[PDB]
Design a protein around this ligand. Structure first.
Ligand SMILES: *[C@@H]1O[C@H](CO)[C@@H](O[C@@H]2O[C@H](CO)[C@@H](O[C@@H]3O[C@H](CO[C@H]4O[C@H](CO)[C@@H](O)[C@H](O)[C@@H]4O)[C@@H](O)[C@H](O)[C@@H]3O)[C@H](O)[C@H]2NC(C)=O)[C@H](O)[C@H]1NC(C)=O
Ligand SMILES: *[C@@H]1O[C@H](CO)[C@@H](O)[C@H](O)[C@H]1NC(C)=O
Lengths: 668, 210, 214, 224, 225, 217, 215
């Protein structure tokens, strides 16, 4: 039994409630045990409890007297028990209950009014039971109930007589998922005082029954509606008729295997704001199919269209101007589909569109011309996602229409060509370009000329050609702060490659072949590419095969806070290499071949470090090699992960596998 | 539903009285106890098993457990003598009653019966009818044996009588009527009402000379 | 750079068995991983790309799964010709690193060998050196104890045995032990015997020939 | 406080329709926190449940199997009442009817009606014959003198007897009614008054009979 | 019909210049990258690097940076791989493959036939082939076997056939063993039914590519010595 | 805001070599590369080469590979272009240009240096007065800058005060080999004898500053 | 090496008209085209960059058009201060090549007569043994003007040299400086010297003269 002001006795196989708990506890957690009974006498001294959780037990029934023992009880969780029958005495004396959980108790039917004196109850959960009806009382009570959960039951009908007990109640959420309901008795929804959210997920309805349902929701106070997976195969302009008389703002129609969307199907919801149509089987989207939805601000069409039939060549066709009505649409997610291509007037109309996700939305978008994104001309687009579209070529002036574009993701494609610079023409407000994971990009001096306002450039694993150009291809990028050039295995770069990037803060260069460039044997000496980076904050140089480090490479890196030189063949470092790193807070040198740590190297480095990482190193356990290091470790404030565990010595054989933490420095 | 109460239960004045109410798992429902006096409307004395309504004495306590719903009245007085009914709504039956319980409060010392015999009025003879009225009051117990005598010959013909009921002072009383003709009233020399109480007899007598 | 290590190193399974080879990466190679199959002496063959995608023209029994640093190649029903060395490769970096590969062998039942001993031809004797060749035809398993015997005396060190691949049909090895001796040692002895001890033979069969009489 | 005034015909002929009316005061008929209903008590101390009625959104009324389809409880939101309709009555429908108020939550009856009595007989309702009763020749030293009123031959039951229209209370006793062999009822009601104030004090008796529309008040002439 | 064919087996001394070829045909040569793979005898596949046939853009593995030179000829549609000065440890099998970008990663679908590079301080010697045959009366079981021994040759490979490649099944060519001297020895047998005496002619044909030698030999048992 | 300053003119001897100066001020010298341009009178312009002020890297034009030699003094913030083996065909104007936020532009240019390959040494300008013999509504005064070498000269009027109504004609080359420039100024007659008119001729190669006053009036 | 072929040779167009210069790229240079204006003497001023984008401060009348290898500079409604030489350039591949250049002069729908003056040799110039007489034609239009010197009513030939300034920024009028150079001997040999201006601005050929000793 763990006491932390909240008594937690979970998974202890307790057959009886503990009697040694302090009189200070207010919460009791008894999930997963073997309690069959709950006597009141065992709960007398603990009259300060405000929350009780006894889920996953074998409790048969509940004593009325017990409810008198906890006058401060707010939340009661009785989920997954054997509590099958309820009476009026069960929860009678628990008037302060605000949350009651009764899931998976195999309750088949509720007697009279067990919850009549629970007028403080806010959330009632009766999920995963065997209730065939919704009647929970014969009078009006529970005016404070806001959530009624009735998931996974045998409820077949909603009757006014059974649901009018909440006439003076305001239900925010009426959960009726996984229920086979086949009829809605007239006036059942008006029987409730205030119904805001209706959830009919996993409920076999059909266009007709859903139509009658919508007719039943008319003139109500509904705001949220979820008809997900109701197998709504088709929709006409009569299906959502009743909803004409509602102020609905959220509609979920996902997982319905929706084949055809008839004209003016959603013309009855001019107040809808959130539309979920993800995961369907739409074969043909007509023009006026999305008419009337001029207040929608978010539309999700993920996997909403049919897959390619391969043989039948059955491609999901989207007619022109099909999105023109959603004038207030700001967020459009059409990712993961088999749309043939981008028509000339496909996205015409969306004059508030700020986010467009086209991730894998097309069968093959192999070429980006100047006419491709012409429909988005009058859209204030800020973010465009074009990943996983098999794009193999980007022509000039392809993004002229997206003048306000800020974030462009062209990653995860087959882009293999020469960047002339004209590909970025029009992007005056460009912020970041994600070009990672592609074929090949041949670089030129004019490659990024037209976009000097760029701050973040990602070229991870794309095979950069001519990156070793004398006038650096990155020269016009003055405002660049983050540059990713990892996984490219570039064997040659020049001195002035990072010239002009005085505002650069984060530099990723891991998994390249820059080793030869830093050896003393390299023609013309070492390549000091870290020259003039006065604002570099995070430097990544892992997995380069570095066996040598020149003394003055890290000279102009004063503001460098995090340095990553792990996963290299580094061993002996020259003196005063980190002499200019005063603002260093994180040092990474794990998985190297370091065999000596001396003061003349890690002196100014260990000054204000808060994170040291040299996990896998073959240290040498002698005085002149480890004394200063161990003596520093014993008195440092630096947080060192796996300090006593993985800091082992590989030499001398006397200290093989011996932790450096336990080395004796009294002999030195 | 099926609720069973004991037929009759007696108790000494000022002793702990107990009433039963049997039923299958009745300990799951809220039981109610009503008190009813003859000539009056039944009044609820116990609701919510143990709660005493506004204007209800603290002598009335209640309980309900298992298969038994028990009512308890300590310090039973003479005014507590009445009928008792238990009830509970349960299913759509919406109010289920029991068999009923009759409480009997013992003495209360024995008293002498006041016998008053009223002859037929003159206006009754104007309508050519006669009926002698025997009226007894204040006696305990209520077990009495009344007889009508014509001179020395007993007459049980044309005799109507009520069963003895209790008054407001917990003493018993009843009324009797003997319907005859004015001719017979002016025939026999004397008619007598003889009331036998616990063996002893209190008698009244009237004659044609009036 | 990135270290790719497979497990197990080598296994044996019967035809029709479902086999699973695991491939671990030192760091996250995401979804980019390929499975290649290599037959002995022949160029590799692309089975799987992108960890789960099945390459065009590849048999249906080959599947692949996994992400992050854990991947798994799965053979549904092994075939007599499905024995090969299966390598995994990472493509999250332009420095592609393969694994050490996994050797797939077949768990055929025990089968006795067909022994045939061959004396040196005279054209070879013309040169001045003799080589006797012992042959074990079609057997299982690999573990074969071949012991030569010159005049009922065990020779050792001067024998070199070559073991062939498993048969493309019945999956049975073939062993050839070559024994080299000088021309002066040839006519110096009498009985030349080849003894074969195996798990497919209760008593070691010895096929022999006598010098001159053969 | 809450008061319930109950009324209706005391005599209903067989195979016809029994009607009753219960008016409420101090509470509303169409509102929650208040339930209503009917319960009859057949002669022989047999407490039976007829029905209940209540409102949440619609009108919800519940009946017994005993009342079958012969009963109908309809409320009147207008005049703040509730009625009772029992079709096809047999002599066993004769009972002491009580209209009742059920109090939420657990249905208990905190308020009953005074109760009205109905009878099924197919008669014609005969009117009572009340005559005063006092001693012809009274000249005693007794400190008590009992005078009364005698009701003769009436149907059906009951009849209410008063003294001085409610002024005289203590000392008043009304005897239970008997059934004559002629099929009619007879009742007596007496009271004891001082012998010193016989001719100096007024004593009048009231008699009320419901189904006959008869109210007879009679003064007893004191005999010197 | 995508096809990649490399050069023949090379046999040079440590210090000599070498240049193996790799020509492709049946596909768009300059459309897909061409990569190289080294495989040391008994060791796993190793990545060398790749080249684009169009612009001859070279990207070597960090291990082979400056240790080898990958070239290409767009005209002949032939990628080349060369060493200026061979080494003792350059002895391995060299494959070339086509890089097909599928599933957003470079994968190799078509491979070469393989080029065996044998570099040692020793010289080349022609093979010596001598037949194998059991005794005269010893054959009376069910099936007999005859043999061919290609002994004392350097270096590998050696191609063994039976009846000019006619006889397929029934034969067994064993791996070559390295003798004490430094020469190889290979055994190649064939199994036939009881009609092995004097029914059909079994002549083995052995070809040795380095020393350019082809020798055929008939196998039968001689009764007298 | 930002200036690249080159010398006025440079007179040189055929066969010899000359360095040309380009001082960068107004910004951080080690930011943009320095480009050079050769422009002959009337003819087109040629891009000589670009040089990095950081590492001294140079991208040359294949024509100026052996004629132009680029260097940069970072401490002095100056780009130097040395022209060797000078011929008369090398006599032209040489500019140093820079790039802006758009590297495909040449926003910042220097005032250019006029290289003159002649071997004739330097002669100072002879300044003579020019006044009529005459009155009329508008009178005309002037100065005659005769016999000097080489180009150019700068002729101001009254220390830069007199501006409008002044025509400084392009210089002409005589048969004697010396340039001769003419300068004039038109002023109303009423202001002839009221104020003072002095012209300032400035010849850079001869270090000559002459102030000649036109009397008469 | 990508070359730049500029058209036309020279250009003359009056005020308010629209002019178009042309540049033909030998190879693909994309949109990287620069148009410079340069008045004689000063360093070239950038007008257009990237073929379509105007420089910061450049008037709206200048506008560039782009198509294939044809890159054109278009000025709508010329103004008198839009004169000078116009050059083009590419910024694609080094080495950068410029255009041949098009010189733009303007015209005006009117004719202005030259203010003719004459200047005698100096008193300090005659010490040198060389006399120079200067004939000035101040602010005129058009350019075509005949200056004929007269030594005692005798036309001089070859010994006189003209020098004309560039077009005016506002009124677009030229000035001409004719110089008659004669040694002190030839000067002191005669008396009356004149210059004759034959132009379409003045009615009859104006002759301005002076006498020796008069000044
Ligand atoms: C443009 O669209 C792209 C989709 O085509 C977007 O890519 C998505 O971006 C998200 C967010 O970064 C990424 O999902 C991440 O997944 C990793 C790893 O997942 C792990 O999941 C479990 C963990 O136990 C297990 O399967 C493995 O261990 C995995 O390692 C998480 O660490 C992240 O938190 C995140 O969930 C994917 O890259 C991708 N998701 C999809 C939908 O495929 C891209 O972000 C868009 N570009 C922008 C910036 O707009
Ligand atoms: C409650 O009891 C514990 C145990 O005795 C005591 O230490 C603590 O002070 C009390 N309340 C808290 C949590 O302060």
């Amino acid at each position: 039994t763990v006491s932390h002001e909240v008594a937690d006795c979970s998974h202890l196989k307790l057959t009886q409630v503990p009697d040694d708990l302090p009189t200070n506890i207010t919460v009791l957690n008894l999930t997963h045990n073997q309690l069959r009974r709950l006597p009141a006498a065992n709960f007398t001294r603990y009259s300060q409890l405000t929350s009780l959780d006894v889920g996953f037990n074998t409790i048969s029934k509940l004593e009325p007297e017990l409810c008198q023992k906890l006058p401060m009880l707010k939340v009661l969780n009785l989920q997954h028990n054997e509590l099958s029958q309820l009476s009026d005495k069960t929860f009678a004396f628990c008037t302060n209950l605000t949350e009651l959980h009764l899931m998976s108790n195999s309750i088949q039917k509720i007697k009279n009014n067990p919850f009549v004196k629970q007028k403080n109850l806010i959330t009632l959960d009766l999920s995963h039971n065997g209730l065939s009806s919704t009647k929970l009382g014969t009078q009006v009570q529970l005016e404070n109930l806001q959530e009624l959960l009735l998931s996974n039951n045998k409820i077949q009908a909603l009757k006014s007589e059974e649901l009018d007990i909440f006439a003076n109640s305001s239900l925010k959420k009426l959960e009726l998922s996984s229920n086979q309901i086949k009829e809605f008795s007239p006036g059942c929804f008006h029987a409730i005082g205030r119904l805001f959210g209706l959830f009919l997920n996993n409920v076999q309805l059909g266009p007709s029954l859903t139509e009658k349902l919508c007719l039943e929701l008319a003139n109500t106070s509904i705001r949220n509606l979820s008809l997900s997976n109701s197998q709504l195969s088709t929709t006409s302009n009569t299906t959502f008729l009743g909803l004409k008389w509602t102020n609905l703002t959220m509609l979920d129609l996902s997982y319905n295997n929706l084949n055809v969307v008839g004209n003016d199907s959603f013309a009855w919801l001019p107040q809808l704001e959130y539309f979920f149509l993800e995961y369907n089987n739409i074969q043909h989207l007509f023009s006026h199919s999305l008419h009337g939805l001029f207040n929608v601000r978010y539309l999700n069409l993920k996997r909403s269209f049919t897959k390619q039939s391969i043989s039948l060549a059955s491609l999901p066709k989207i007619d022109d101007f099909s999105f023109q009505w959603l004038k207030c649409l700001e967020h459009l997610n059409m990712e993961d589909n088999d749309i043939p291509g981008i028509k000339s007037n496909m996205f015409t109309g969306l004059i508030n569109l700020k986010y467009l996700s086209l991730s894998n939305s097309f069968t093959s978008l192999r070429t980006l011309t100047n006419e491709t994104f012409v429909s988005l001309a009058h859209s204030p687009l800020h973010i465009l996602n074009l990943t996983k579209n098999k794009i193999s070529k980007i022509e000039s002036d392809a993004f002229s229409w997206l003048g306000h574009l800020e974030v462009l993701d062209l990653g995860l494609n087959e882009i293999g060509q020469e960047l002339t610079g004209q590909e970025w023409r029009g992007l005056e407000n460009i912020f970041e370009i994600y070009l990672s994971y592609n074929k090949y990009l041949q670089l030129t001096r004019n490659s990024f000329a037209l976009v000097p306002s760029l701050q973040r450039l990602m070229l991870r694993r794309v095979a950069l050609k001519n990156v070793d150009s004398s006038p650096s291809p990155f020269q016009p990028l003055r405002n660049l702060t983050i540059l990713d050039l990892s996984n490219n295995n570039i064997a040659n770069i020049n001195d002035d490659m990072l010239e002009g990037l005085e505002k650069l803060e984060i530099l990723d260069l891991q998994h390249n072949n820059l080793a030869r460039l830093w050896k003393h044997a390299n023609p013309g000496g070492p390549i000091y590419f870290l020259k003039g980076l006065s604002h570099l904050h995070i430097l990544n140089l892992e997995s380069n095969g570095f066996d040598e480090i020149p003394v003055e490479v890290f000279k102009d890196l004063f503001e460098l806070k995090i340095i990553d030189l792990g996963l290299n063949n580094l061993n002996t470092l020259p003196a005063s290499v980190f002499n200019n790193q005063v603002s260093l807070k994180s040092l990474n040198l794990q998985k190297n071949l370091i065999t000596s740590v001396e003061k003349k190297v890690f002196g100014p480095a260990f000054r204000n470090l808060t994170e040291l990482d040299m996990r896998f190193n073959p240290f040498d356990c002698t005085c002149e090699s480890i004394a200063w290091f161990v003596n520093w470790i014993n008195e440092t404030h630096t947080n060192i992960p796996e300090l006593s565990s993985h800091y082992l010595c590989n030499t001398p054989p006397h200290y093989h596998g011996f932790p450096v933490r336990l080395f004796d420095t009294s002999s030195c | 539903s099926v609720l069973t109460q004991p037929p009759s239960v007696s108790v000494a004045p000022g002793q702990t009285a107990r009433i039963s109410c049997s039923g299958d798992n009745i300990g799951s429902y809220y039981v109610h106890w009503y008190q009813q006096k003859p000539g009056q409307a039944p009044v609820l004395v116990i609701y919510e098993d143990s709660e005493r309504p506004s204007g209800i004495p603290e002598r009335f306590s209640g309980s309900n457990s298992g298969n038994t719903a028990t009512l308890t009245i300590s310090g039973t007085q003479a005014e507590d003598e009445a009928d008792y009914y238990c009830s509970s709504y349960d299913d759509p039956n919406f109010q289920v009653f029991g068999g009923g319980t009759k409480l009997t409060v013992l003495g209360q010392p024995k008293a002498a019966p006041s016998v008053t015999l009223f002859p037929p009025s003159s206006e009754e003879l104007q309508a050519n009818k006669a009926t002698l009225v025997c009226l007894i009051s204040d006696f305990y117990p209520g077990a009495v044996t009344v007889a009508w005598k014509a001179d020395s010959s007993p007459v049980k013909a044309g005799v109507e009588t009520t069963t003895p009921s209790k008054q407001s002072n917990n003493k018993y009383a009843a009324s009797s009527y003997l319907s005859l003709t004015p001719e017979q009233w002016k025939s026999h020399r004397s008619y007598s009402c003889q009331v036998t109480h616990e063996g002893s007899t209190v008698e009244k007598t009237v004659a044609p000379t009036e | 750079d990135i270290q790719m290590t497979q497990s197990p190193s080598s296994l044996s399974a019967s035809v029709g068995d479902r086999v699973t080879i695991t491939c671990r990466a030192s760091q996250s190679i995401g979804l980019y991983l390929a499975w290649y199959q290599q037959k002995p002496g022949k160029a590799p063959k692309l089975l799987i790309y992108a960890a789960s995608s099945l390459q065009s023209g590849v048999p249906s029994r080959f599947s692949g799964s996994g992400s992050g640093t854990d991947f798994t190649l799965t053979i549904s029903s092994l075939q007599p010709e499905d024995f090969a060395t299966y390598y995994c490769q990472q493509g999250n970096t332009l420095s592609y690193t393969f694994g050490q590969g996994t050797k797939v062998e077949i768990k055929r039942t025990v089968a006795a060998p067909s022994v045939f001993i061959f004396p040196p031809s005279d054209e070879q004797l013309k040169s001045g050196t003799a080589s006797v060749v012992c042959l074990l035809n079609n057997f299982y398993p690999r573990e074969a104890k071949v012991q030569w015997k010159v005049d009922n005396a065990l020779q050792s060190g001067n024998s070199q045995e070559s073991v062939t691949e498993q048969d493309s049909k019945d999956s049975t090895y073939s062993l050839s032990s070559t024994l080299t001796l000088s021309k002066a040692d040839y006519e110096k002895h009498k009985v030349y015997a080849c003894e074969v001890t195996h798990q497919g033979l209760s008593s070691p069969v010895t096929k022999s020939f006598n010098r001159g009489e053969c | 406080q809450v008061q319930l005034q109950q009324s209706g015909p005391g005599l209903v002929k067989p195979s016809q329709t029994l009607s009753l009316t219960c008016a409420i005061s101090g509470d509303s008929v169409s509102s929650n926190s208040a339930a209503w209903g009917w319960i009859r008590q057949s002669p022989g101390r047999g407490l039976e449940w007829l029905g209940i009625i209540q409102k949440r959104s619609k009108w919800y009324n519940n009946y017994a199997v005993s009342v079958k389809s012969r009963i109908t409880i309809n409320p009147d939101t207008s005049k703040n009442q509730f009625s009772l309709q029992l079709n096809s009555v047999t002599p066993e429908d004769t009972a002491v009817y009580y209209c009742a108020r059920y109090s939420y939550p657990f249905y208990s009856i905190d308020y009953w009606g005074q109760g009205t009595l109905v009878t099924v007989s197919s008669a014609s309702t005969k009117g009572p014959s009340v005559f005063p009763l006092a001693p012809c020749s009274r000249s005693t030293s007794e400190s008590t003198a009992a005078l009364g009123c005698l009701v003769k031959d009436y149907f059906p039951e009951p009849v209410t007897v008063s003294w001085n229209s409610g002024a005289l209370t203590s000392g008043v006793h009304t005897f239970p009614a008997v059934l004559q062999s002629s099929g009619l009822y007879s009742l007596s009601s007496v009271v004891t008054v001082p012998s010193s104030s016989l001719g100096t004090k007024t004593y009048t008796c009231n008699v009320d009979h419901k189904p006959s529309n008869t109210k007879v008040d009679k003064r007893v002439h004191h005999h010197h």
